Design a protein around this ligand. Structure first.
Ligand code: G5T
Length: 863
């Protein structure tokens, strides 16, 4: 069909990889993944196009509620769809959207002299010119939009939208018309030869081979004989391992490292001993190697796609049996594991077992006791599953069967425990499947919070068709915001060969489940394409002429029909609720920094003042660490708000979209501390002492009694960013990467470095900010110590969630970020949070750290 042909080509251009490329690999695993996930996603699409109108609002416009939500007078402007006539009426912040709706309908029934057929139940309230709605049984104050409006002071502008208008949205966005355990001999392989090997001729080539189950060795590593350096080395030798074939676990991976010696790392390659269909692999394998930068268990189990240039090791998996051998079914495993003597020892060991299960590495005796008392772990200490899993001998078929028997009847664990279990330290497929089962209870807001880390876990996966991929696919198809960000997280890494096939396959499947959103996403990709072209021009022009010259030329380029069409009328990749309507060419510019980032401004008549939004397009820098930093600061703000603490944070959007490409949300009405401190003449802020400048700027933006609120907003945000930077080890902080909103809110930009990269980042307190907290007065202990009280409260809240930060940072090790590549980087978080201490101990350690930062600050106060 011609419709099927166009969608296939639109998916090809969207994901940046031709679908013909999947067919050309002729791999049954890819073929089975494509068929099964296409069928799964098309089923979700069929379920969706029949949702009820409120359920469809829940899919397309998921509610944006305050972390607290999951009295005071309020003024709201309401209009009915299309009609310019609006009504401004006074409601309460504790009133429900329904009372606001009944209120709007009585007005409409009086202005147009008619009794209305419609009940307030037939409507939803759209936030003007935004893909955002207020509905459900929540007070208005609980909504992020109203909450935002209350804190700024602006009047909420809403539109009454009927059930028929949303059902038409549902309808118009529709998809088109239609045995192993007897094998006791040692595992061995023949190392045949190597191809296209590049190394110094004076050296010899060595091939190191290891058997792993995640990070753990299953036996000793074995090395081949040393053979002279040349293009095609020949070994033709048998490498025998210290593990029987029966003892190989399901997720065992054979890892190879090729290097040179007189060590000179050349390349590495890994493969799974069992295939996607549970069969024990046999015959020849050509391993297209990845060039090193020595065994890499965490590395991908798929070969290098660049067959032309990659080094290629040829190996032979021996035929251990005349007929094919598959991993035993769960039915056999449980039968073997059903047999085991129950641990029945004294009260002495019970107190000793309690001590370590509630407690980090264990001793040989501590491990043996946990294993012996495994039945008691299931029944009395279920949350110690991860401890029990780490002591299990994964190199023993009998021990694995006994662990798996307990797991299959293990109670579901909290979301926090499940997050720990997705770590590469837990590579078992049944463990992985258990971890997902416990994560099904995640809310969409919680899933959204951890989506970034979940997408990184996909890089650990041994097969394409996996439980985590199906989970993410199902949830993405069930929530448009989830769908939007899952797409971008994957799309932004299509330039990385190790993930391009897996990510491309997930994105294709998603597109099969939502034809309309694929087109919505293509419109975003067309804008990004133009921004790249425009940014390339600016980069060249900025080196050949003056700034007004490049800016005027940039404008001419944007004003072209092609650019005006592509850059306007799209959902924002930073936030699909944000609609970027009319590009305001005259307000567009570029920044003076290395990559000359573009500064793009938008307007929307329908949204009014809220439709005025900016995006920064930046090309040449990996923005993944910046996004992780901002997402961690956003989590801090959520955890603080859950404890009733609002530190007036600015968690602006940051999204990588391509190879060293991404967008940054513009926070309007904000300026850098560096600019304010330049202390320009002929301005309201013009100071007598440079220390007076921020406060003078604050005064000019906040006249009269508004100044008290601005100092408080500054104080709160300062406390939050001081704690955020200290906990995350955010260094290289100066007046040009610190910004201030006209409300007084302090926020940080461009997170180039974190986790103290390795020098331990000290707590930072700077006099000019102490000067605003203290209201300009030289001595204001009342104000300063109230700030120290805000810092201390924010710190102890993060500590109570110390394990959530460690589990998320652990899953992030999969991302491949230079400042997050091992255990040293995580030790920074463990140290900054002081989780190996008591609250009184860590608080005193924080107070000593803060006091040390006040003493360093006081060196500037002496002058
Ligand atoms: O997270 C980053 C990464 C790189 C650059 C920036 C950056 C640089 C200048 C301005 C700017 N902001 C955005 C927020 O709104 C004010 C301008 N962000 C932020």
């Amino acid at each position: 069909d011609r419709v099927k042909k166009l969608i296939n080509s639109q998916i090809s251009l969207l994901i940046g990889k031709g679908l013909h490329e999947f067919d050309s690999l002729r791999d049954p695993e890819v073929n089975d993944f494509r068929t099964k996930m296409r069928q799964f996603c098309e089923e979700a699409a069929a379920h969706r196009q029949q949702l009820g109108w409120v359920e469809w609002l829940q899919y397309s416009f998921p509610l944006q509620l305050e972390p607290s939500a999951r009295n005071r007078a309020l003024l709201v402007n309401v209009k009915f769809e299309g009609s310019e006539e609006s009504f401004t009426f006074q409601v309460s912040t504790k009133d429900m959207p329904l009372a606001l709706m009944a209120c709007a309908l009585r007005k409409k029934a009086t202005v147009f002299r008619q009794p209305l057929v419609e009940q307030p139940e037939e409507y939803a309230l759209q936030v003007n010119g935004r893909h955002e709605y207020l509905y459900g049984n929540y007070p208005l104050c609980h909504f992020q939009y109203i909450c935002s409006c209350l804190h700024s002071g602006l009047t909420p502008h809403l539109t009454m939208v009927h059930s028929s208008s949303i059902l038409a949205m549902r309808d118009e966005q529709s998809n088109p018309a239609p045995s192993l355990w007897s094998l006791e001999q040692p595992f061995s392989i023949e190392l045949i030869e190597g191809r296209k090997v590049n190394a110094d001729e004076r050296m010899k080539l060595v091939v190191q081979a290891g058997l792993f189950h995640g990070n753990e060795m299953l036996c000793k590593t074995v090395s081949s004989s040393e053979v002279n350096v040349c293009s095609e080395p020949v070994w033709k030798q048998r490498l025998e391992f210290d593990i029987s074939v029966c003892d190989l676990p399901r997720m065992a991976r054979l890892c190879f490292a090729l290097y040179a010696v007189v060590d000179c790392p050349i390349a590495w390659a890994n493969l799974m001993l069992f295939d996607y269909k549970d069969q024990l692999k046999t015959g020849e394998r050509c391993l297209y190697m990845w060039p090193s930068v020595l065994l890499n268990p965490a590395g991908t189990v798929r070969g290098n796609p660049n067959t032309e240039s990659a080094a290629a090791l040829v190996i032979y998996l021996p035929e251990v049996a005349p007929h094919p051998v598959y991993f035993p079914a769960l039915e056999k495993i449980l039968e073997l594991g059903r047999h085991g003597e129950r641990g029945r020892i004294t009260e002495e060991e019970q107190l000793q077992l309690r001590e370590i299960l509630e407690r980090g590495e264990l001793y040989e005796h501590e491990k043996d006791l946990v294993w012996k008392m495994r039945h008691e772990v299931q029944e009395h200490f279920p949350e110690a599953l991860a401890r029990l899993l780490l002591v299990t001998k994964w190199n023993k078929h009998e021990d694995v069967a006994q662990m798996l028997y307990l797991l299959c009847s293990w109670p579901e664990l909290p979301v926090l425990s499940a997050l720990e279990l997705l770590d590469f330290s837990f590579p078992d497929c049944y463990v992985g499947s258990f971890a997902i089962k416990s994560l099904r209870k995640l809310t969409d807001d919680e899933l959204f919070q951890y989506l970034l880390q979940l997408v990184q876990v996909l890089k650990y996966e041994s097969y394409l068709d996996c439980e985590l991929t199906k989970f993410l696919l199902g949830r993405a198809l069930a929530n448009r915001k989830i769908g939007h960000f899952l797409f971008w997280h994957l799309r932004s890494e299509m330039h990385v060969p190790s993930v391009a096939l897996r990510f491309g396959l997930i994105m294709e499947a998603y597109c099969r489940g939502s034809t309309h959103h694929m087109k919505v996403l293509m419109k975003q990709g067309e804008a990004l394409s133009k921004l790249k072209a425009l940014n390339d021009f600016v980069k060249v022009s900025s080196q050949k002429t003056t700034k007004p010259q490049t800016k005027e030329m940039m404008h001419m380029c944007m004003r072209q029909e092609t650019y005006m069409e592509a850059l306007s009328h799209l959902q924002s990749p930073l936030d699909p609720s944000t609609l970027l309507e009319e590009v305001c060419v005259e307000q567009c510019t570029f920044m003076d920094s290395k990559m000359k980032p573009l500064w793009i401004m938008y307007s929307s008549e329908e949204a009014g003042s809220a439709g005025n939004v900016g995006i920064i397009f930046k090309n040449g820098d990996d923005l993944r660490q910046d996004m992780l930093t901002l997402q961690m600061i956003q989590l801090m703000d959520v955890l603080w708000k859950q404890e009733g603490l609002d530190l007036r944070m600015t968690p602006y959007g940051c999204l990588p979209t391509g190879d060293r490409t991404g967008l940054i949300e513009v926070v309007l009405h904000s300026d850098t501390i560096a600019n304010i401190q330049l202390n320009k003449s002929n301005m309201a802020a013009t100071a007598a002492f440079n220390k007076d400048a921020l406060l003078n700027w604050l005064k000019s933006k906040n006249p009269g009694e508004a100044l008290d609120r601005a100092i408080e907003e500054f104080t709160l945000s300062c406390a939050g960013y001081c704690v955020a930077t200290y906990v995350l080890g955010i260094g290289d902080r100066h007046s040009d990467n610190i910004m201030i909103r006209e409300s007084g809110q302090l926020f940080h930009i461009d997170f180039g470095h974190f986790l103290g990269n390795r020098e331990r980042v000290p707590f930072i307190l700077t006099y000019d900010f102490v000067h605003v907290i203290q209201q300009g007065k030289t001595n204001n202990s009342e104000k300063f110590e109230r700030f120290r009280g805000y810092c201390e409260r924010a710190y102890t809240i993060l500590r109570r969630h110390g394990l959530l930060f460690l589990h998320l940072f652990a899953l992030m090790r999969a991302a491949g970020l230079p400042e997050l590549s091992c255990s040293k980087d995580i030790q920074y978080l463990k140290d900054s949070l002081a989780l190996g201490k008591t609250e009184e101990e860590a608080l005193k350690h924080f107070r000593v750290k803060f006091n040390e930062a006040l003493r360093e600050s006081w060196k500037t106060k002496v002058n």
